Amino acid sequence: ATGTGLVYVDAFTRFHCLWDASHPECPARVSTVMEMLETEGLLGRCVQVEARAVTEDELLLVHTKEYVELMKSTQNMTEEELKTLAEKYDSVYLHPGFFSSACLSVGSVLQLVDKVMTSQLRNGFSINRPPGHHAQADKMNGFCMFNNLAIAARYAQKRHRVQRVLIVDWDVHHGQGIQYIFEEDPSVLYFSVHRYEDGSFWPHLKESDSSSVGSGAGQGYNINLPWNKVGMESGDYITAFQQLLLPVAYEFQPQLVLVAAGFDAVIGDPLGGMQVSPECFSILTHMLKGVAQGRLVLALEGGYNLQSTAEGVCASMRSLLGDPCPHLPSSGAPCESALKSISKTISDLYPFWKSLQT
Ligand SMILES: CCN(CC)Cc1ccc2cc(COC(=O)Nc3ccc(C(=O)NO)cc3)ccc2c1
Ligand SMILES: [K+]
Ligand SMILES: [K+]
Ligand SMILES: [Zn+2]
């Protein structure tokens, strides 16, 4: 009842980029996480939860039937056919086992949602690949086939009857797929902090700026925090949570929190350009446990330095398990650029959240 669930299956290693041996999204990402969780003694403290394959009806909560069928057909394609299809999307590869692994990747999150919503566990972490946060209703994107967390949010609502879900995306990239899926939906609050640099950084979208607040019934329920300088640190992230995310989260009163738990903002990542210590993620995880009765599920997104990502997962897991947060050496104060971004996001979201008004 007070336990932390962990989902991992060997199938998560059974796909890789056939035409580029240097591709950063590779099986070692999850192997190294599991090895470090074990050597740190954290794996044995978790409740191992079985994965399952997502069903078609679960996928259809987010994705179109035509897209699901096309993705299913990739399991029977030749390498040349896989490459031709992958080239129709941005930043994607395909492999004959990609679809099977992607189905287990979604299902791993759903299994944890079941355990957490029924109070059989307190919280949990899926150690899954492929990632999900860029996947869209009818498109692969950014190493993603199916939108793991968007499916999990709608599943929590349909199966477990949850009214409000908060999705917190701390991967260094903007989860535009999640934003698009819930753009008009006030029942799923999406918060993303991400490198932006005025669009210079992938995925180069105007709608990754803080002016994209959602639309229609969803106006105010999409919150982007774009960083416009590299080198952000733990104090920048903690300050963003203290000034912006936590006040809104308590006002929103979510009944489940899902985290797009990428670790490409950790120091040493080859792509992220940030300098966040792995230990920061103990604090950020702790800061999210005070809403939704602690019903908190993390799912792996990006993160490409094998050691940095494994250290970030372990730091998050220590907090899920209830270990006291470490002291961080830095003061917690944000740099000027981070403060500028936080203030601008608050300015854009002020009209929709009493907890931000001054
Ligand atoms: C020899 C020097 N190069 C190494 C090969 C450096 C280099 C740096 C950045 C590159 C960026 C792109 C654009 O494409 C993406 O960045 N894609 C992408 C990345 C991460 C995630 C993710 O983690 N999301 O959460 C999603 C999508 C393409 C090529 C690049 C090459
Ligand atoms: K993000
Ligand atoms: K939304
Ligand atoms: Zn990323």
Side-chain angles (χ1 to χ4, degrees), residues 7 11 83 105 196 305 344:
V7 182
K83 190 172 176 174
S105 186
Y196 185 51
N305 177 309
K344 179 59 163 59

Side-chain angles (χ1 to χ4, degrees), residues 91 133-134 142-143 171 173 202 264 271 302-304:
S91 289
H133 69 150
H134 300 303
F143 313 157
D171 186 283
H173 299 97
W202 193 95
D264 39 14
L271 292 169
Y304 305 101

Side-chain angles (χ1 to χ4, degrees), residues 133 168-175 190-195 260:
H133 69 150
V168 175
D169 184 337
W170 71 41
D171 186 283
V172 83
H173 299 97
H174 182 218
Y190 179 57
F191 174 87
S192 179
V193 51
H194 44 267
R195 181 175 172 184

Side-chain angles (χ1 to χ4, degrees), residues 27-49 51-64 66-79 81-138 140-205 207-274:
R29 297 180 61 242
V30 296
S31 295
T32 57
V33 169
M34 293 301 294
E35 292 162 10
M36 190 180 289
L37 284 170
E38 166 136 28
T39 60
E40 290 299 305
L42 299 172
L43 182 60
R45 296 175 58 200
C46 293
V47 176
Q48 290 262 21
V49 175
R52 75 182 198 235
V54 70
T55 65
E56 183 178 315
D57 290 327
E58 288 162 347
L59 286 172
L60 292 171
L61 295 173
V62 165
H63 297 286
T64 69
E66 315 89 87
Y67 176 65
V68 172
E69 288 302 328
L70 183 62
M71 296 301 95
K72 183 176 182 179
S73 77
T74 66
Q75 63 188 291
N76 304 313
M77 285 180 185
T78 66
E79 175 169 345
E81 293 171 327
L82 290 167
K83 190 172 176 174
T84 297
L85 176 54
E87 289 183 343
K88 301 187 188 311
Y89 304 114
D90 192 57
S91 289
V92 142
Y93 70 86
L94 278 165
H95 179 283
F98 206 114
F99 172 79
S100 172
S101 297
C103 289
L104 291 160
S105 186
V106 179
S108 69
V109 189
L110 307 188
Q111 286 282 91
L112 292 171
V113 170
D114 284 351
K115 301 299 200 239
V116 170
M117 289 310 310
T118 60
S119 299
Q120 295 170 12
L121 295 174
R122 176 174 282 160
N123 56 41
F125 203 146
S126 56
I127 310 305
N128 54 308
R129 60 181 292 264
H133 69 150
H134 300 303
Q136 291 160 53
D138 63 0
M140 302 184 74
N141 184 269
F143 313 157
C144 302
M145 180 180 283
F146 297 132
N147 201 312
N148 303 326
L149 294 189
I151 298 161
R154 293 228 164 114
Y155 172 83
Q157 296 177 318
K158 180 176 168 183
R159 177 80 77 89
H160 296 280
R161 315 303 297 162
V162 164
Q163 300 98 69
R164 290 177 307 281
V165 181
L166 166 66
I167 299 175
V168 175
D169 184 337
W170 71 41
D171 186 283
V172 83
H173 299 97
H174 182 218
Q176 86 284 47
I178 304 182
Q179 168 170 312
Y180 296 164
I181 292 161
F182 300 109
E183 163 76 16
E184 303 192 283
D185 190 344
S187 73
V188 181
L189 171 63
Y190 179 57
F191 174 87
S192 179
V193 51
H194 44 267
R195 181 175 172 184
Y196 185 51
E197 293 178 296
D198 291 288
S200 186
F201 189 66
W202 193 95
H204 314 293
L205 304 172
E207 62 267 37
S208 305
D209 209 349
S210 60
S211 54
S212 284
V213 300
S215 60
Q219 193 173 38
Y221 295 89
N222 192 81
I223 306 180
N224 286 329
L225 176 56
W227 300 139
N228 292 313
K229 292 191 173 182
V230 300
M232 297 304 182
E233 298 168 325
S234 64
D236 302 307
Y237 278 74
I238 295 163
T239 297
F241 274 42
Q242 292 178 317
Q243 292 205 24
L244 171 60
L245 174 56
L246 268 58
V248 168
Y250 282 92
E251 187 174 353
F252 179 63
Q253 285 191 272
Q255 294 154 325
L256 174 62
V257 182
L258 301 175
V259 180
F263 298 91
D264 39 14
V266 179
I267 304 169
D269 192 83
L271 292 169
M274 303 295 163

